[PDB]
Write a protein that binds this ligand. Structure first.
Ligand SMILES: O=C1N=C(Nc2ccccc2)N=C1Cc1ccc2c(c1)OCO2
Length: 351
């Protein structure tokens, strides 16, 4: 009957509340800028578990959620079998101006698992299987003229995030290892079809490619850049580009990956970042000092020198190509030698 929302537009709601007259809230799953996610029991479909994304009562976010519902439904029509690992939408509705999307309940997202593991990195076999799945899911989207644009660890969910705790003797610390590394891709609120208007700036800043910063236009290679940043973060446990400002971000890119190719510099209208073909920046700023203290060349972040590690870094570097026309495609990444080390079960998604 009566319903309340806060000045930020979120729905005020506690455990035990019902929505429509079928979803009963039984836990909190997290909250973004979009709204909240809550675990609900579906009293219309067997008292079964759904995750319920409750969107803020704000124009911008309602709109993004209508867009997301159109993507999700188009995806489930293109993939009736669920073979391409996108979260499965079971229902949607409008609850007093809050768009609500019901999803099949999954475990922790890959960021939260990492955070609860004190940011100890995923083991390489896990990184490999997660990479394979992301590549598979996104390659599917890509070939259906879709680009996600907001890939990041929080938008990647474990199907089941149950773990075992081992004791690591090198690190003199306990360590959690997820029992099943099957994942799903979430959050299509920013997903853009080839034929739709492309906003100048997309992606969360840390996962944002240089073509976006340099306003060179973007398309599917944007997601491949994001994936490379994500694999790094899974493998080291910290963010590759821990940045909050464009100039600083470009400096990190150069320091981690080498010079921005001169042809992208010629093409950009953001010439304020350059002078005589070189990036311009204040080395004495807190931003400058931070990047000089902390950003080193990609290869130096490698933890082990064995082949499987060498190959991950070859893959990552091909995903972090500056030029989006030369950046590896996901179709091509799926053929990369790094993936030879998957088990047959992993390769066939029987996990
Ligand atoms: O589309 C989304 N965007 C999400 N963002 C998010 C959700 C919780 C914390 C931080 C970010 N979550 C979903 C969907 C989702 C779908 C199934 C789930 C779930 C979340 O939590 C566990 O089950």
């Amino acid at each position: 009957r009566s319903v309340e929302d806060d000045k930020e537009g979120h729905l005020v709601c506690r455990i035990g509340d019902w929505l429509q007259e079928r979803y009963e809230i039984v836990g909190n799953l997290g909250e973004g800028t979009f709204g909240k996610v809550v675990e609900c029991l579906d009293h219309a479909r067997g008292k079964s578990q759904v995750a319920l994304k409750i969107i803020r009562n704000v124009g911008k976010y309602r709109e993004a959620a209508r867009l997301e519902i159109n993507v999700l439904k188009k995806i489930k029509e293109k993939d009736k079998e669920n073979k391409f690992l996108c979260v499965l939408m079971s229902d949607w509705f409008n609850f007093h101006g809050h768009m609500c999307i019901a999803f099949e309940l999954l475990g922790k997202n890959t960021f939260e698992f990492l955070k609860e593991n004190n940011f100890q990195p995923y083991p390489l076999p896990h990184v490999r299987h997660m990479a394979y799945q992301l590549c598979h899911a996104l390659r599917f989207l890509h070939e259906n003229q879709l680009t996600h644009t907001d890939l990041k660890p929080e938008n990647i969910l474990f199907v089941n995030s149950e773990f075992e705790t081992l004791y690591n003797e090198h690190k003199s610390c306990e360590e959690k290892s997820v029992k099943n590394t099957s994942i799903r891709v979430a959050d299509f609120g920013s997903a853009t079809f080839d034929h739709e208007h492309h906003t100048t700036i997309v992606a969360t800043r840390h996962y944002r490619p240089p073509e976006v910063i340099l306003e060179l236009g973007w398309a599917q290679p944007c997601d491949v850049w994001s994936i490379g940043c994500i694999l790094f973060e899974y493998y080291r446990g910290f963010t590759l580009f821990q940045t909050h400002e464009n100039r600083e971000h470009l400096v990190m890119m150069e320091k981690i990956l080498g010079p921005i190719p001169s042809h992208m510099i010629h093409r950009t209208r953001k010439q304020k970042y350059f002078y005589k073909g070189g990036l311009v920046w204040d080395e004495n700023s807190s931003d400058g000092r931070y990047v000089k203290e902390n950003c080193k060349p990609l290869k130096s972040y490698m933890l082990q020198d064995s082949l499987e590690h060498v190959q991950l870094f070859d893959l990552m570097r091909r995903m972090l190509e500056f030029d989006p026309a030369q950046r590896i495609t996901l179709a091509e990444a799926l053929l990369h030698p790094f993936f030879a080390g998957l088990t047959p079960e992993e390769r066939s998604f029987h996990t």
